[PDB]
Amino acid sequence: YRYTLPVKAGEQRLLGELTGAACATLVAEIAERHAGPVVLIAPDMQNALRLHDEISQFTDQMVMNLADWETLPYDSFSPHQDIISSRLSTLYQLPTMQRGVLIVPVNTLMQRVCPHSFLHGHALVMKKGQRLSRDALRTQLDSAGYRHVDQVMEHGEYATRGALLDLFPMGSELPYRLDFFDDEIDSLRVFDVDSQRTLEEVEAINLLPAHEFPTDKAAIELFRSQWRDTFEVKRDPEHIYQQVSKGTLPAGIEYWQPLFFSEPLPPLFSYFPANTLLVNTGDLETSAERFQADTLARFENRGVDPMRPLLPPQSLWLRVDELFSELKNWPRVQLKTEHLPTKAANANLGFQKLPDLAVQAQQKAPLDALRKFLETFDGPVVFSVESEGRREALGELLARIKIAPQRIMRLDEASDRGRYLMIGAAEHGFVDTVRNLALICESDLLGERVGQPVVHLEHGVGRYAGMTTLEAGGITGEYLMLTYANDAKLYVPVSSLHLISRYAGGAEENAPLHKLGVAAELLDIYAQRAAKEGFAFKHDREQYQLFCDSFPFETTPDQAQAINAVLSDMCQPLAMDRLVCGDVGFGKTEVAMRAAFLAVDNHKQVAVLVPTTLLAQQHYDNFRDRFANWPVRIEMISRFRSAKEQTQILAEVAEGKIDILIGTHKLLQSDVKFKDLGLLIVDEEHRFGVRHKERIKAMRANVDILTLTATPIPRTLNMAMSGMRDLSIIATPPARRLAVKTFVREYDSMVVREAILREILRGGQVYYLYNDVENIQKAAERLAELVPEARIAIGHGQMRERELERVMNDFHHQRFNVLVCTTIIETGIDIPTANTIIIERADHFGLAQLHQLRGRVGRSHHQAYAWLLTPHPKAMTTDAQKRLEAIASLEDLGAGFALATHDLEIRGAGELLGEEQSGSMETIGFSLYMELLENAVDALKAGREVELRMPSLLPDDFIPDVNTRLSFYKRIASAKTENELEEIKVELIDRFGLLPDPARTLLDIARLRQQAQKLGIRKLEGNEKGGVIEFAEKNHVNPAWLIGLLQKQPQHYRLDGPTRLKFIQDLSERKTRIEWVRQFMRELEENAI
């Protein structure tokens, strides 16, 4: 094609011009026409994973990585032998492979592996008619290195029961049972780890050794001999000599691998088949050198502690000279993104970078660049979307420019004038000018980043109050007198004028003055919701089965049980009030998604409420992905959405066309009116408070409230445990969640650097919580210097939305590892790749907050740490010590509920009938609460703007019971005549006596609104400083008289807009404001036309 392939001893083939996301397609092309393996030598482990997700998009060849030890050179952690099973297995198939791509970083390629005589000397194939005794096979496995257990579940274990020998080989991912008979294998049956029953029978099966070093007694004797040969022995039962002599293995024993063989570990280049074709990326002379330097530095730093000494780095890792001498034994194709000028063994491939394509809502036409680019491109263009739901997010996005991309499976299918789309992890696009093809990825539509007050510094802020003469012991001196708070006079000598500075806050008339030197509403809501019957959802079996099939996991028995309880409760006439309190990351969201699917199948406009914008966006993405194959409309509302589209969303929701609306506190602002609400889902309830939780409940009395959380606030936890609300605990798998490690250390730069470098070398991402927007810029800048290897961004909710959104989006796409963040990431942002969180100052954080932050790491098969940096402990407050010792005391999966029940009964449950969820508060007992609720329910069953910034209500001391209060509210608000308002007033006086000031203000506000409704003033406002009259489209104000008022008092009447009239009045008193407004409106209506 465009270039030949290198087939010789060590010849090179340098290809240039390959832009981003071009090396992947080039590797895919090479692997499809080379009759042999391709070993892709990535320059960095991170990059390797990237290619593993890109090449697999463009080809069908077996693209697989080489599982490296997840630890660090000379670390103190085992490789978690499961990974070892993924490593030996490859090493067994690697000498004999004919087609496929094997991806190795420089870190793993520079490592040395076992001699392969341990591979095909400890590894077996067992057929049906094997004349091998029971004990012979048992000792065979024991010498191989298997562990004798009785409940074999994982890799490298076997169990025996008489004639039933069941072993889990490291060749396959499933165990097998032999069912011996007469010292012969009768059956070779695979049995499940969960059901313990046979699925089928395999004629021949392969098994691999437990570890990468021999473990039998002869191996231990050889290890001891090599140890006494190389190092020196110390009599101490933790020294890794007398610790391996006993029989157990130290933590990081894998770096003492050469001691078990008595033969040098080959460079792994012997493992490649005869004809491989190494494909490079970036450069190796730099990455290999950096890895060698880091390994040598860590060997010198850790070549101490004579107990557990370290081997030379040349006995475990190839020298860079050895690596680059051994790379000359294979042909190589070097993919680099630069213009290679001209020569043989050198080619250029037109892969220009994509033109300026971006989307922005600022202009009238957002897709201007796209619409103009797709018109003037003669060749094909293929969009690349990472997810299936994302495809829709890009399919209706291109519908505005009248283009429907036909989907293709391989890039070769692109016709000449074709707009196509494909799914894969491609990040950036290109313009292959050679065939005039174009690839446009999802990130190529975003672009780049887008009486005078006086201050005296000694004391504070006072009010200048003139000059005075004062005697001071026979000396009369002149002073300037300042009146601080509480009329405390301070006399500054006129000579000392320089400490008297002018106020700088721009609030000369709003400056401070330093000192020198709910039960009813909640009861009624509970009674109303417990009085009537909620919607009885209708459940479809097979149609919901498809939605279940859409889930790419298996619900763990506890998550499935919570799901069943939720659906069973929704399918009842009673209103569902439930809690889903399970530990973080255990699939809590999916239960809510299933409940939402059940509700929306009956057209009930599920409403999701999350206490942060990032949760809103993440749940929007997740819900859109899951519901990417149903006729359900999902929309997000928050401050991120513009003011022009938020109104559109509200109109759509009120119309009844958006069936899922995910929103922050905006959902409770009284302007979010649902057409037909039947399901609410409050996620992370412990960051809302009682008011926000029942605000929506009051409007839709019988809505079914689903409540998800990990650490409930004590009030709602006691409420659930006492039976007021149903409870569902999810403390179980997801399978490969791993026991987030907790370390409570005093702050240290070396600790932070070590943790960040450990995470970076793993390829993950680090959370670095600072939680102070003022100094977060300085903190991130300082961390950038502390760890130059890391890429650092800043993320918090106090910067502009278009910036925070893009920064968080970039963090998803691995554009940087460390993200110095505030507590905005405490609410449940998933980001599976992030598995190390560093809290700079954790002393001042609640147990719930600390556990939630610790729950952000992990979320996957990886081992995740959680460092909680603290100041010097004596400086910490006692409660900080208690909370830190409690949080570090509980490091287990499912511990989020024990911690919640500790935070309750340490802080105590709050007022059950009121606010203040956390605290003793001397709350009323549950027996009393149920009695009052039943009493209110029974009493209710046999039943059934001119705002002036002043209280206008019926106080509790006026009308104790709630139902009477609500009835009179309805009667006053619905009264359409002053006569009926007077009747209500007389009824109030008859039944309760004197009218409090709030009651009289409410009644006269009702009267004023009644007058204004007839007149035409839609919104008459007032504050202490004045007010605004907002007339209607067709008001009844006499124009000539209005102009007369304007020209007689310009200062008190100013038209600012078509219908907004600002009046400025020093309305200090509520009564005076009421009467001034009364007379203003009266003189208005007398002239009404």
TrEMBL record:
Q: What is its main location?
A: cytoplasm
Residue intervals passing through the bilayer: none
Q: Which InterPro entries match?
A: CarD-like/TRCF_RID, CarD-like/TRCF_RID_sf, DEAD/DEAH_box_helicase_dom, Helicase_ATP-bd, Helicase_C-like, Mfd, MFD_D3, P-loop_NTPase
Q: Which Pfam families match?
A: CarD_TRCF_RID, DEAD, Helicase_C, MFD_D3, TRCF, UvrB_inter
Among the GO biological process terms of this entry, one is: regulation of DNA-templated transcription
Where in or outside the cell it occurs: the entry states: Cytoplasm
Which EC numbers does the record give? Answer: 3.6.4.-
Helicase ATP-binding domain residues are 569-730
Q: Which parts of the chain are coiled coil?
A: none
- Helicase C-terminal domain ranges (all copies): 752-905
Whether Nucleotide-binding counts among this entry's keywords is yes
* MF-aspect GO terms: ATP binding; damaged DNA binding; DNA helicase activity; hydrolase activity
An example GO CC term for this entry is: cytoplasm
Keyword Hydrolase on entry: yes
Keywords noted in UniProt: ATP-binding, Cytoplasm, DNA damage, DNA repair, DNA-binding, Helicase, Hydrolase, Nucleotide-binding
Q: What does this protein do?
A: Couples transcription and DNA repair by recognizing RNA polymerase (RNAP) stalled at DNA lesions. Mediates ATP-dependent release of RNAP and its truncated transcript from the DNA, and recruitment of nucleotide excision repair machinery to the damaged site.
Family membership noted in the UniProt record = In the C-terminal section; belongs to the helicase family. RecG subfamily.
Enumerate the PANTHER family for this protein.
ATP-DEPENDENT DNA HELICASE HOMOLOG RECG, CHLOROPLASTIC (PTHR47964)
Spell out the protein name for this chain. Transcription-repair-coupling factor
Organism in which the protein naturally occurs: Escherichia coli
Lineage, opening ranks: Bacteria, Pseudomonadati, Pseudomonadota, Gammaproteobacteria, Enterobacterales
Which gene produces this protein? mfd
